[PDB]
Design a binder for these strands. Structure first.
Lengths: 171, 126
RNA sequence: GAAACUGCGAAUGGCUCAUUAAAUCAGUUAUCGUUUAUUUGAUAGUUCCUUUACUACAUGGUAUAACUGUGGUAAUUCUAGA
RNA sequence: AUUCAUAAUAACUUUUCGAAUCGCAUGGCCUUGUGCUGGCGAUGGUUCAUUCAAAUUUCUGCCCUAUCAACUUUCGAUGGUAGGAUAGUGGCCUACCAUGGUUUCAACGGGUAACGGGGAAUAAGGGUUCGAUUCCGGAGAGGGAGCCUGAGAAACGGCUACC
RNA sequence: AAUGGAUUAACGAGAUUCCCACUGUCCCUAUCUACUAUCUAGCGAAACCACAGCCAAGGGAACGGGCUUGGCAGAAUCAG
RNA sequence: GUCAAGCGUUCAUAGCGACAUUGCUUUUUGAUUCUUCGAUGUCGGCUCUUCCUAUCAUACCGAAGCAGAAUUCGGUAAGC
RNA sequence: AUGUUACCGCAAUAGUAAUUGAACUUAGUACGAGAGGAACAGUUCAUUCGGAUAAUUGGUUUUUGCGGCUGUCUGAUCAGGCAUUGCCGCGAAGCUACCAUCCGCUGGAUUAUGGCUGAACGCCUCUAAGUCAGAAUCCAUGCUAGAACGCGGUGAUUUCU
RNA sequence: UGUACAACGGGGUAUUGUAAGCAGUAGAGUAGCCUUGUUGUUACGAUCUGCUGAGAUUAAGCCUUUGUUGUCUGAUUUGU
């Protein structure tokens, strides 16, 4: 099986090809939002605790929230909802999914960390991806920094230097 | 192996124990026992049958599953820079914000500038 | 200035004549019995609601996409996760 | 021709509109302040009217058939009252009530190699026949049903199901 | 062809064929119930009876319980 | 079964085998009337066992006008 | 009935059972000009028959166990009787089903047939003496009963009778 | 006269489907009350909800018992 684990503060993410079939039998019959023990799955993950975010089973059909079963279903989905993007306004659509219970049918299980255990993880905690963008709005910058109502966000602006050739500029 | 759930009673069906039914519409039902099977053939409603899990959960009996939703009593705790602002100098200028005579003097400069602007504009208009 | 968000439009055109014999249709009336985007002409002194501190108006809050990357199906204009 | 337009009393509203939008140009007063004012626009915006529409609607008119003369009303057929729905009248639908309504001046039923019309061939006149078919109005998207989005669709080069 | 012929609606515990339903008739049998059988106490017949009661072949009135030659042969008995 | 005129492209016999002929069986049908007329319950089916083999199939083999497949003839064989 | 009684055994004799097919593979190979088209071994399955068993499923249900239903009687209720087991639904246990499941042995002598050496018949010949392999055959292994007049081994064998 | 036996009781396992009794600001409603409510009260009224996966039955050929109460020398026969 695979565990697509993520650490959201570091913004990091990695897949882990898991075996120890019984240390994933623990994951069996589990819902979304629930948090089980890193040590229980793996002493390499000793002390850690994750949260079962979701996952794709075979045939790539994701895990959807709220349905409360492991078996697959055909839902007449609509906008503002996971597992369907509408290619037109108004289009509802019947699509197949898998539900919010964990079992062998799954192939990749998506996890998020809420607490960092005692040891350190190679591709999640030792690393941290930066914030790709800076806040583009005045007050968002202003409150992000904690300056004032008048501290000139215009000069607190972000400047991201890049070189076209040798001419360089922050754009 | 796996264990499953009676359509009617909603009970674990250990392997072999029990019957299975496949309606013409390809709906696969499972029954732990001929009791459930016979009721199903009678077209009964388990939500009305009392000993069933559906009635149990519809009348809210044995409700030890749900507890509450947790809440954190704090903030995000990141007054960080925006990757192009040098957070040290950012906090330094945030602290220089009070005692605002600097921005006030810049305003006074641009203010006398607007004075002279209207003056010279009227001069050019004349 | 791609992609993407957004706004429009995608209900026109084009094709066929299966349906349908007071039905469509044609002329002829009405809406004093109704909707009408769009255009076009005009048109919002009165929005502090214990209305005195209850509230920035040289102006307020929220994502979320695109993107970064993890990716999952044999396949889908398939899609989740951070 | 109105209980019209329109105005005011008294309240209702889960609260509608009353510009936190954008490009150019930068103009004037000095109470010398980033004070105050200012233009040409685009966008959107409540109401009314307009325009392109849309839906219903009055009179008249449709081929052959009586080897089809009674038809309609159970469970709407005709009307009325009240209400619901509609964007709107109204059996459109319901509750209740009267039992009516069409018919040889051919109802109703059947058939149609029938979509209709503007028109075409053909002729002294009268006329007969054709007219799917370039324009107008209708219907449909393989048959049916349903519905979302939207001002506008019962959309099909859009969704849902069944066949 | 009133020693009646040809039809004939309805009627028939009439004879016959097929279809629908239905079904333990059947594939293929199983299970249950009461009354029996069964055992007991008590009562208590009948039919039938040359004598009796193990098979094979032989021949024989040509298909024997008996005779012949072989096989075999172990008290008394219950249910069927 | 014997014999073999002939058929079989040619060749009687791989396989068939007319005309002639020797036998077997008692599953037919006759013929007979021994037993049985002071009664042996009389067709078939159903059920159920057992037996023979003149073997349909299956086991092993031989021959062929048997390339292979398919087929035909024949042997031990009645286990199934 | 064998001296008694109990236990463990032997095993004469009799009975006997397992049967057939398909599929994949061998192989589109061999063979065949082509057309077409094999086989042994191996594997998985089934047919028929048999012998058990009841975990599962099904059936059966006087558990007259639970609940309900009708009519009627017990003043009404509660709880019950009668209805030739009143009726329905569920229904354990037990019984039971190719309607369910499990299992169904391997060695020798042989036939037919093909052969080895080998004379008679100075050759030759499977035969005459001798001899090899060989079948759903036959007999043993195995399985069933155990001679009630077949047997063996072992234990304890009565007292103030 | 004992890791003895038996009848009851208990526990478990199974079957069934939520007992009677009480209460209800539940209840189609219909009548009557008046201080005419805002749960108005009262009589009747299937049924519903809570106590209640409650109650009942459970070896008779289910399992198990630190429990309770009891039982435990009647007859006959047998010899190498």
């Amino acid at each position: 099986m695979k565990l697509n684990i993520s650490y959201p503060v570091n913004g990091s993410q990695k897949t882990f090809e898991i075996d120890d079939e019984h240390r994933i039998r623990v994951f069996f019959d589990k819902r979304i939002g629930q948090e089980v023990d890193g040590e229980a799955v793996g002493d390499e993950f000793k002390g850690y605790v994750f949260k079962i975010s979701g996952g794709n089973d075979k045939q790539g059909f994701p895990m959807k929230q709220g349905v409360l079963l492991p078996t697959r279903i055909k839902l007449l989905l609509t906008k503002n909802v996971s597992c369907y993007r509408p290619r037109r306004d108004g289009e509802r659509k019947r699509k197949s999914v898998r539900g919010a219970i964990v079992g062998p049918d799954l192939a990749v299980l998506a996890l998020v960390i809420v607490k960092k255990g005692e040891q350190e993880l190679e591709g999640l905690t030792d690393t941290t991806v930066p914030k790709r963008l800076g806040p583009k709005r005045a007050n968002n910058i202003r409150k992000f920094f904690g300056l004032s109502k008048e501290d000139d966000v215009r000069d607190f602006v972000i400047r991201r230097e890049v070189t076209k050739g040798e001419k360089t500029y922050t754009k | 192996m796996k264990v499953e759930i009676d359509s009617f009673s909603g009970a674990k069906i250990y392997p072999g124990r029990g019957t299975l039914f496949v309606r013409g519409d390809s709906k696969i039902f499972r029954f732990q026992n001929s009791k459930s099977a016979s009721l199903f053939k009678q077209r009964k409603n388990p939500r009305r049958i009392a000993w069933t899990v559906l009635f149990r959960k519809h009348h809210k009996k044995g409700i030890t599953e749900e507890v509450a939703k947790k809440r954190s009593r704090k903030t995000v705790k990141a007054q960080r820079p925006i990757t192009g602002a040098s957070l040290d100098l950012i906090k330094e200028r945030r602290s220089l914000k009070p005692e605002v005579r600097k921005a006030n003097r810049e305003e006074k400069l641009k203010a006398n500038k607007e004075k002279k602007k209207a003056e010279k504009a009227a001069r050019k208009a004349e």
